[PDB]
Every structure is written in structure tokens, then in C-alpha cells.
């Protein structure tokens, strides 16, 4: 009930700037500093649900588990006022978190990126002049900044170790970082010199190529006319519209002294300014095609015509399944209303994403309902098609804004994440899939997708990655007992594994590669109480009693089943869900999470906890090995003769003292090459002590020795080599490589 949302006055699906801002309005009327009445307490509560709500692994885990995983300092009133969420109220300044930095910076568009580090000196002197340089520069480019103080590993990934640090991204091209004095004229010309400013001297000589060039391209001139003792657009207006209208208009002038004849065809003798659609026509008699203006603002000009740029091309329902799976489509789903109506500048859609191949269009699902409702599209929605052979797309669930649609389009459009629903859902199929069930009012589902699509990529052809949309598709999540979002589930033959882990495309793949090859078995209480408490024979059991809410536990399960599968036929391994049952795990006295345990063979202790430092698959795996008991046969004089010598089967054999210091040593690994190379070889020890005279005869002058007996079938024959090797692993392929050269 004293939930962390609650305590901030906020909700579940509050962003992260929300978050920020409500904890700083608490922050600064609960404050110590201007408290005599108790504070720090009161403080300490919202303290404590805003660092968790903040941290991107602990609010998703806050989510899904709420306090029983997290387990358990601040800065002064003056910090708080002054230095705290300082661009949250620029709405010129565009904060980015660490997953949806790549995105963004690879847009298309150019960003200029304030990287800084909270604080009094640090900022302040660059805050204001920041905040000023955005606004002076709105229009020609995208002003970021960000906060590595809470993304710290962003900065760090980024080679960003000083503060601030400025940068200037755009795609296709490397990171220039700005080292001038940090002046709003001295930004501004830094930034100016990254802006693409093309402004063309039109001429009667280039005229017609110039236009022709433009409009086959579908795109249309702003071009200002020049003559004595008239305004015109000034040098400074033209490049400002250049920079702004860039790939959309191109912008230009003439000298109507110079070029006459231009002019006198044209028919515009006066200054005037105008803007030529593909298509246009101008001369004496017609002067309709083309619009005239009469600003000589680069601003009032520029709204003038990204009003005037035509919207969209409306997709004809009639081509879809064949025209959508074979090409990339940018598709504005809307009932009736054009819903864009509001907001010209999505028009740059178009030229932003040409060189990713995408038409942007709209389409009416008010002309073809069957059509949006087999795509499950109840309101106007976002959609971008990867047209590759086959109907795939994903939808927007981001800003409807430019900067945010762009980005979204070009990493979706390149990535292999699909939308899934009912009629195309993995239940049984028999290549693997990995699906995320997700919320798109869910912040950390939203957050997700970026690394959904990273690990997509990188997994083509070994996993197929896709989302569904609980808040459309309940009937589906509930099914699969959806509780949380988002949730991520492999789907391998249709069975079912939730996955935990970091979706980074390594840990993916690690983790579907024991999926194919399980090396754990997951164990409940009626079949622990069978295979584990009625263990039989040579068995031995290694079990992991865990908890998914635990911390620990999640780091060791990817380490637990590395170390299963190099114990695949030494030692039996399971696993036990103590969430799941809780009540079976408090019977079995598992007071920690995780807890590891032993069992030996029946035939006196029940079991042993491991209680070592380290929990790394290498040292549980020796942990386990050294409880096993000998597997080589002790021979005798008698027994050696017979069985090795005259006998008709591969042997290693172990010569040693009971008191030299590396028979010792070497006693346990000897025990491991016996249970490896077990059933091809049989395994021997022979105690020289005991047994001087056999030890006399095969010639050991060291303990321990190791030799290798092998029978020549054909010739009825045992002949012997010395293994001097001590490693078990070592051995036992250089045994098995002798094997195959004697058949």
C-alpha cells in the first residue's frame, strides 16, 4: 500500500522526467535543511523510492517482485533546487537514457549532446548558455544532453570520463567532439559548420537542370528573385531556410540583373519570393502552379510552407500482402481524420528516411476495417514494414513526434523484432523463439524493445524474436500466466522457459543452448522426493535451491548450468523453485537463497551446503567432484597380473605411495579420469608400499606414475606407455585419440 509510485504522488507508468520532478517537489518541502521536526526520516522514504524507481534493473524488478527482492544518503536542499533535473523544464533539450541513446544519435538527424555530471560548478556556467543555444538553434538541429551520473555506464561505453563533454552525432559519419570556449556564438558556429546550408546562385545557364533535377527527385525550389534597389531574402535568411528545410526544399536566388533573360521569362521583374512544387510552371500567362510569399523571415517562410508541402500518399488497401511484404512501408493508420493534421513537420519522414528505403504513408481504415482489424489496429496507430518477403512489422508506442518516430523507424525497419497476435503465435513450432509480453503504458516495456531488436539482429537464424501486446492480445497472456510487465519467454518446441537474464544476444544464445541440451533438471517436490531423497546405486545429486526474486540467485543460474554441463555423467543436477514452493523449501531448511547442497550415495549425512566464497561454475564444480568416492579399482599383485596384464581390456593404471606428497595431489584428479574415460577404460591403482615387488617389476622409479595398458586384439596382446601428463582432461583425450588409431 506505501507503494514507491504512491509515495511520489505518481503512477505506475510515470516516465522517468516525471519520477525526477515529483521526488524533487518532496524533496525540497521534506528536506532537513529546512526541518527542525524529526525529516530525515520522511526524507529517507521517498529517498529510497525514488533510487529504486529511477534505476531501470530495479524498477522492472520492483514491478514484477515489488520490496521482497530489493535489498537495501542523499544530497542537500540547495542541490536539490538548484542543481537537480536541470533541463527537465527546457523543452528545447532532449534528455536521453542510456538504451534509447543509439537510436536517436543514429536517427538521421544531427545532434549536439551536452554529456555532464550534475553539480554546482559543473553546469551552471554551461546550463544557461545551453538552454539559450537551444533555442537559437531550434529548427536546424536536435540539442541532447545527458546525465552521467545516472547513466554511468553510457558515459563510460562512451569513452566520456570528463564533464561536460560536447559532442556532434549524425549517422553515417564519426563523433566530433567540440573543444572551444563554450560560448552560445562559439556553439552555434561549431554547430553551424555540421548544419547542411546549400544555398544555389540560379542562373539562366543552370536554371532549367537545377529544377528539372529537383522536381524528378520530388523535390521543389525556394528560390528569391534579386535586382537593384529591391529587398530580397538576405544571404542569412536563405541559409537559415536551407538548414531547415533540408532534403524537403531546396533553397536558391537569382540576379535579375545578371540573369535578365531568366527573368523576363519567368515573368517575376520585381523581388519576389517563391516556392516551385514539383510540377510547377512559371511564365507570363501562368503563374498559378506556383506560390508566392510575402515574409522575408526565414521562420514565417518555413511554416508557410511545411503547411503547404503535400501530406502523405494514402495507400490503396488494394495492394497490401503483396505490396507490404515486399517493401519498406512507414504506414499512419487512421480512422476518417487524418490525425497528423496538427503537425506539418512529420513531412520530413520522407526525406529523413529515403536512404533506409521506406515510403511514408497514410492509409484509411475507415475504407478497408477488415484490413486493420486482422492487423489487430483498433485506434489510429504507427507501423513500420521490413518487407523482406513477408508481412513483418512492428508498432510505435513512443512520442508522436518526429525526432522519436524517426528513430524508431530506422532501428525497427533494420532490426528483426515481428508483432505477434493469435493467429501468428510460436505455441508449437519448431524453431526457437524468444517472445516478450509487454505493456506499452509500461516504461521499462518500452525500454526493452531497443535491446530486443540489438539481440535480434545479432541472432538471425538461430532464435526468431518477437513482442506481443498483453493490453490487446489478454486472452493470449493470460494463457501463459502473464503477471508482470514485460516478460520474456522462450518458446522451444512448445515448451516454455521465462528468461531472467541480461538481453544481450551472448546471454540469449548461452541460455537456448542449454535449452536444447538441458543440463539441470528442474526438480519439484514429488519428483526431489523421487530422484533425489529415493536416489538409488551410484547416484549423486547437486540441487540449487533459488529464488527468481533473489539477486544472488540470478547471477548463478547461468553459472550452475555452465557447471552442469561439464558434469554430464559424473553428477546429477537440479534446481528448486523456492517461490514456487515456498512451503516445501521451509520444510527442507533452506534459509537462504541460493542455497546449494550435496547429496552422496546412499550406501551417512543427508547432504552438505556449499559454504565457499566464490560461486563461479569452475569452483562448484570442483566443490561437487571431491565428494565422489574412489571409482579405480585397488589391484593386487594377484589382481594386476591377471586382469591388466593377461586380460583383455584398455587400462590406466596409478602407481603410487600413500605418503608421497603428489600421489596425494594427484589421487582426485586420477578418480575424475577414471569416471571419464569410464567404459573404455578401465582404472587401476597400485600401492608400491603394499606392493614393492610388482612396483619393482614395472619399473617405477617416481610416485605417482601413470601408465597405459592397451590391448592389441589382433595380436592377443596388452603393450604399455608411460601418460606423463596430470590433468584428467588431458589424458583422457590423449587416450581416446590412441583409441581411434587402434581400430
Known amino acids: ?81 538548484y542543481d537537480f533535473g536541470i533541463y527537465d523544464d527546457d523543452p528545447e533539450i532532449i534528455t536521453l537514457e542510456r538504451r534509447e541513446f543509439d537510436a536517436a544519435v543514429n536517427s538521421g538527424e544531427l545532434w549536439f549532446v551536452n554529456f555532464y555530471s550534475p553539480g554546482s560548478s559543473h553546469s551552471h556556467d554551461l546550463a544557461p548558455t545551453w538552454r539559450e543555444f537551444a533555442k537559437e538553434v531550434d529548427g536546424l538541429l536536435r540539442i541532447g544532453a545527458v546525465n552521467c551520473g545516472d547513466d554511468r555506464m553510457l558515459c563510460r561505453m562512451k569513452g566520456v570520463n570528463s564533464y561536460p563533454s560536447l559532442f556532434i552525432f549524425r549517422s553515417g559519419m564519426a563523433a566530433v567532439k567540440y573543444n572551444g570556449d563554450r560560448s552560445k556564438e562559439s556553439l552555434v558556429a561549431f554547430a553551424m559548420q555540421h548544419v547542411r546550408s546549400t544555398v544555389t546562385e540560379l542562373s539562366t545557364g543552370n536554371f532549367v537542370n537545377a529544377i528539372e533535377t529537383a522536381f524528378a527527385a520530388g523535390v521543389g525550389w525556394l528560390i528569391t528573385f534579386c535586382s537593384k534597389g529591391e529587398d530580397c531574402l538576405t544571404s542569412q535568411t536563405r541559409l537559415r531556410l536551407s538548414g531547415m528545410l533540408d532534403g524537403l526544399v531546396n533553397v536558391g536566388w537569382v540576379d535579375c540583373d545578371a540573369q535578365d533573360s531568366l527573368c523576363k521569362s519567368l515573368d517575376t521583374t520585381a523581388s519576389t519570393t517563391a516556392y516551385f512544387p514539383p510540377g510547377a510552371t512559371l511564365n507570363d500567362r501562368e503563374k498559378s502552379s506556383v506560390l508566392f510569399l510575402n515574409s522575408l523571415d526565414a521562420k514565417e517562410i518555413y511554416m508557410e510552407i511545411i503547411h503547404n508541402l503535400p501530406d502523405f500518399e494514402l495507400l490503396s488497401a488494394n495492394q497490401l500482402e503483396d505490396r507490404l511484404a515486399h517493401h519498406r512501408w512507414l504506414v499512419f493508420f487512421h480512422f476518417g481524420k487524418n490525425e497528423n493534421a496538427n503537425d506539418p513537420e512529420l513531412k520530413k519522414l520522407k526525406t529523413l528516411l529515403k536512404n533506409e528505403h521506406i515510403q511514408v504513408v497514410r492509409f484509411d481504415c475507415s475504407s478497408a476495417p477488415g484490413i486493420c482489424s486482422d492487423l489487430y489496429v483498433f485506434q489510429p496507430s504507427l507501423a513500420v514494414f521490413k518487407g523482406q518477403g513477408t508481412k513483418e512489422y512492428e508498432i510505435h508506442h513512443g512520442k508522436k513526434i518526429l525526432y522519436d518516430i524517426l528513430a524508431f523507424a530506422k532501428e525497427s525497419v533494420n532490426s528483426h523484432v515481428t508483432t505477434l497476435g493469435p493467429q501468428n503465435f510460436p505455441a508449437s513450432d519448431k524453431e526457437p523463439w524468444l517472445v516478450d509480453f509487454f505493456a506499452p503504458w509500461s516504461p521499462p516495456s518500452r525500454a526493452l524493445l531497443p ?90 545429486w547437486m540441487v540449487d535451491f533459488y529464488s527468481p526474486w533473489s539477486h544472488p540467485s540470478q547471477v548463478l543460474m547461468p553459472e550452475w548450468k555452465r557447471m552442469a554441463r561439464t558434469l554430464t555423467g559424473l553428477i546429477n543436477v537440479g534446481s528448486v523453485d523456492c517461490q514456487q514452493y515456498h512451503s516445501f523449501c521451509t520444510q527442507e531448511n533452506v534459509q537462504r537463497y541460493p542455497e546449494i547442497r550435496f547429496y552422496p550415495q546412499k550406501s551417512a549425512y543427508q547432504y552438505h551446503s556449499y559454504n565457499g566464497w566464490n560461486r563461479d561454475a569452475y569452483s562448484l564444480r570442483s566443490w561437487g567432484l571431491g565428494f565422489l568416492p574412489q571409482a579405480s579399482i585397488d589391484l593386487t599383485p594377484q589382481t594386476f597380473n591377471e586382469k591388466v596384464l593377461q586380460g583383455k581390456t584398455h587400462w590406466v593404471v596409478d602407481f603410487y605411495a600413500p605418503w608421497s606428497g603428489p600421489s596425494q595431489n594427484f589421487a582426485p584428479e586420477f578418480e575424475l579420469l577414471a569416471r571419464m574415460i569410464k567404459g573404455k577404460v578401465r582404472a587401476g591403482k597400485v600401492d608400491c608400499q603394499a606392493y614393492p615387488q610388482t612396483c619393482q617389476k614395472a619399473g617405477i622409479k617416481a610416485y605417482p606414475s601413470v601408465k597405459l595398458y592397451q590391448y592389441e586384439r589382433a595380436k592377443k596382446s596388452i603393450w604399455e606407455e608411460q601418460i606423463n601428463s596430470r590433468d584428467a582432461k588431458t589424458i583422457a583425450a590423449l587416450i581416446y585419440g590412441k583409441l581411434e588409431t587402434l581400430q
Open 1 to 81: 500500500d506505501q507503494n514507491f509510485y504512491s509515495l511520489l504522488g505518481v503512477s505506475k507508468t510515470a516516465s522517468s522526467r516525471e519520477i525526477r520532478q515529483a521526488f524533487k517537489k518532496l524533496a525540497l518541502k521534506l528536506h532537513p535543511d529546512k526541518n527542525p521536526n524529526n525529516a530525515h526520516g520522511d526524507f529517507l522514504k521517498i529517498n529510497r523510492a525514488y533510487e529504486v524507481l529511477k534505476d531501470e534493473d530495479l524498477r522492472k524488478k520492483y514491478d514484477k517482485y515489488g520490496e521482497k527482492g530489493l535489498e537495501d544518503q542523499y544530497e542537500s536542499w540547495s542541490y536539490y533546487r
Open 451 to 540: 535491446e530486443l531488436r540489438k539481440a535480434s539482429t545479432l541472432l538471425y537464424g538461430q532464435l526468431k524474436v518477437g513482442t506481443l501486446d498483453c493490453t490487446i492480445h489478454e486472452g493470449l497472456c493470460n494463457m501463459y500466466n502473464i503477471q508482470a510487465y514485460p516478460t520474456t519467454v522462450v518458446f522451444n518446441q512448445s515448451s516454455i522457459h521465462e528468461y531472467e537474464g541480461h538481453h544481450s544476444a551472448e546471454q540469449i544464445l548461452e541460455f537456448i543452448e542449454d535449452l536444447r541440451n538441458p543440463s539441470v533438471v528442474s526438480l519439484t517436490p514429488s519428483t526431489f522426493n523421487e530422484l533425489v531423497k529415493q536416489r538409488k546405486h551410484d547416484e549423486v
